[PDB]
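Why predict the complex rather than its parts? Because the way molecules touch one another can change local conformation, and only a joint prediction can capture that. The input here totals 545 residues.
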Amino acid sequence: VQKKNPLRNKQIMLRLNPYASTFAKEKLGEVKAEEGKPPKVPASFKELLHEA
Amino acid sequence: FKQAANFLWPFKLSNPNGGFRPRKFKHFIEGGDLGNREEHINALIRAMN
Amino acid sequence: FKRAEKYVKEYREQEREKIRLARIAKQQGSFHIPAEAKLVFVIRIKGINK
Amino acid sequence: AGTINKPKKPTSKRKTTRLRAKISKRAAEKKRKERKLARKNPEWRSKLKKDPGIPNLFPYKERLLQQIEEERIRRKEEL
Amino acid sequence: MGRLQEYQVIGRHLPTEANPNPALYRMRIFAPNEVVAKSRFWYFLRGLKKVKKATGEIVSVNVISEKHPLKVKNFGIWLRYDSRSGTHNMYKEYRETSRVAAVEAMYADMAARHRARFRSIHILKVVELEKTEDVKRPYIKQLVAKNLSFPLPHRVPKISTKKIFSAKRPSTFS
Amino acid sequence: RKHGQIPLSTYLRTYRVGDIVDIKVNGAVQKGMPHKFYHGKTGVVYNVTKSAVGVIVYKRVKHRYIEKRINVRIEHVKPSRSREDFLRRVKENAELKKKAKAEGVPVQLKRQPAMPREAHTVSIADNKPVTLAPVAYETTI
RNA sequence: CAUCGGUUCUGGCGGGGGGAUAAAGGCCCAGGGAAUGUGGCUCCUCCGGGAGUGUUAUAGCCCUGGGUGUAAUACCCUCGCCGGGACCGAGGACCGCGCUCUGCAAGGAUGCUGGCGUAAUGGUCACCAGCGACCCGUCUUGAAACACGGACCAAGGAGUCAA
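Output of the joint prediction:
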């Protein structure tokens, strides 16, 4: 009798998708990147980037 | 994908919140809204939805 | 439930894999061309007159 | 001219619909006519375009000529 | 013409049996976004080589940021613009802090002074004047002078447009 | 077509009922020539005679199509390559589907249109990109 | 007024990802360079300041590489949270999908309270006000104009019957 929005009414969200509670609890929208020192930019890349 | 998309009824969006560009019936490259805007379609989807 | 968990994991892995391929190409001194898009969303924004 | 003390009849800028439509149609007919005379026009037209060149007030015009000459010698050596 | 960003766009012809490794072409293009940048790349490449969008690919699009946006610099822009007569050269100079800001000032100045649109202007070179002796336009030479200090006469005070009536006649000396 | 002698492999082509034929009228032979229309048209063989064949054409008149049966000598008919892309394909699907059913692994057996290309990596070494201006500098020379 | 559901406008906050793992920039380290040449020195002087010299001095700047640094921030994308407001309440025992499962925001609004109980709400007519609004038929042609009819009212008045 009434279409309810899953993005607003969380009960319909858990009806359509039971994994929503696990998503919100485990914070899968805030997953940090893998650790490790990032390699620097190669000099040829910057030279081509700033080449006239 | 064909069966899923044909099962999905065509989406009836509302008008964009914030409107269109000043001249809408013109290509997106020229400064309008028609044509392929590539990844910029998402802001239009949030405005129209 | 298990299927949605698998789908979320697959989306995250695809995103990080695209970023990783771009980064390793940049570090090896080349250019990674990403795949052309397979999905488009078409919106009709003009009327039905003339 | 004694315009300031005794002005004349004003020139109206308010155009009429008849005049607007007639001017638009004459403009379109003129465009079609010049396209026809352009297709029938026998005047010679160069395929190449005379390039304007490089401005004298560009301060690095000498370095650009150096670059062009160097690339020409490099292309001649490669060929 | 808007908030512009400079992009390097590198593209090439599609690899065939005759040419497994076709040549790469890189251009520096001022555009509001990457779609316009790629469109301008394909336009300028159609103007020079036997490559179009249907027979070529975009290898890379990268943003070229200014090395020193906090340093006041003099830029010389050599450009060609299309008018009723034809294509004409212009050399102009702008005292800005980035190449993109110089290009926006260029587009505004050509629109204001010669009625030239974005579609009719080709940016051929944007260079940095390393020395002040390379400055040629007197309106930049009066700005690069030694001990440049000037007043600002007749400064209209900024009064809020929603405050209609004031009880004091404003002064123009601050 | 060159003036003079007609090639003689025209007579050595065998036409059967149901074959698809083009109509390319030879100007040298006047016997068996069809109308000014029905030249450059593709049709179906329904009758095979000693020196001529019958071709089914669908002419248009007003707002309808009318079947026409045209008797054309072997001089002016040519085998049509419209259904060779069908016959070669259907044979190829026949043996490929037999082999795939014998092996076990299912395959995609329908022809597919041009899909967007996948991701790949392009090396810069020995293929360093060259910087281009809107106009060529040797041209500005 | 409180607690809700549907739609929607707007504000703030907490995270994540990307790019030159932003670019800058600060603080250090190692080089190089110049003037719109700082200090010093010299020459003029109205001695107020100018002129010449040279690379930091009794100011500083620019270029290149390295460290802090996986720095911050801008921009783009994204995961949530907390407010402020408007319009709406369709259905009428239960069933169903569900959840945080003694119950519930889960197949459409209930709970508490106040005043009044009458022209108070509501309605009709007359008039003012804001906005909108050419005189009806017919004819013409593709249409408009032109032309034609209309002072007003009551009654009568025009696709019927037979074969």
